[PDB]
Amino acid sequence: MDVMNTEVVTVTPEMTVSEVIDLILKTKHLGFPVVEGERLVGIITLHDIIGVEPEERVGNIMSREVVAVSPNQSAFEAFKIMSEMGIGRLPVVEHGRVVGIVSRSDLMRIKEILEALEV
């Protein structure tokens, strides 16, 4: 994984969507991996948040079957998974523990950077 953000904004299944809304306002992130400690359990994006009562807990609307990737895999292998399943953000897990995150944008930018490299 040459491309991933190791400072990951995560949530717990017992946090409320009112608190997740604050994280979107504070961090300007679309999705957040759901963790118990450092262990991935689910993922929640803006899709799954609108529109439920602010007291609703994350664990009831989060996606449990998370498409992730390992740090021992290439960034291009994640770009294939993101395109083959039309999935925005991919958590990066090692021993079931969230260590980073890579998403489409993160890899779409790599295309443009590689375009301009003939010096």
């Epitope: 990951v8 994280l23 961090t27 963790v35």
Partner: nanobody, 117 residues
Framework: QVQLQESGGGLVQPGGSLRLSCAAS????????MGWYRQAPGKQRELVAA???????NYADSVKGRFTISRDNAKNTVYLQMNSLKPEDTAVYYC???????????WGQGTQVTVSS
């Protein structure tokens, strides 16, 4: 912008209880999520417990129930209360600040907690 000064720690007999504290100073700090990471001699860095500005906690499986986290919003300081300290809890305990359930943006210098008989 962000500074994290850790306090507490040191020797503690096996099964005893010890508390850590971490003060958050600076103008770049504004009700951030604070947590505790540790690292044993040979092992890698590992989350112990974190707590957001809302008060939502997040513990590892390994210190769950034994360790409880709390914070003082006006003092902008966090408290890690360690109980029933096993010898595998001997590590350098780092204080972190950031956003979410696993804050890792800003780190402390680490305080040594030794659990030996």
């Amino acid at each position: 912008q962000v500074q994290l000064q850790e306090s507490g720690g040191g020797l503690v007999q096996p099964g005893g209880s010890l508390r850590l504290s971490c003060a958050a100073s600076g103008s770049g700090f504004n009700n951030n999520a604070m947590g505790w990471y540790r690292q044993a001699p040979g092992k890698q860095r590992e989350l112990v417990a974190a707590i957001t500005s809302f008060g939502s906690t997040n513990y590892a499986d390994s210190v769950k129930g034994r360790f409880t986290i709390s914070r003082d919003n006006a003092k902008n300081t966090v408290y890690l209360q360690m109980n029933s300290l096993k010898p595998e809890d001997t590590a350098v305990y780092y204080c972190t600040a950031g956003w979410g359930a696993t804050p890792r943006s800003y780190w402390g210098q680490g305080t040594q907690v030794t659990v030996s008989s």
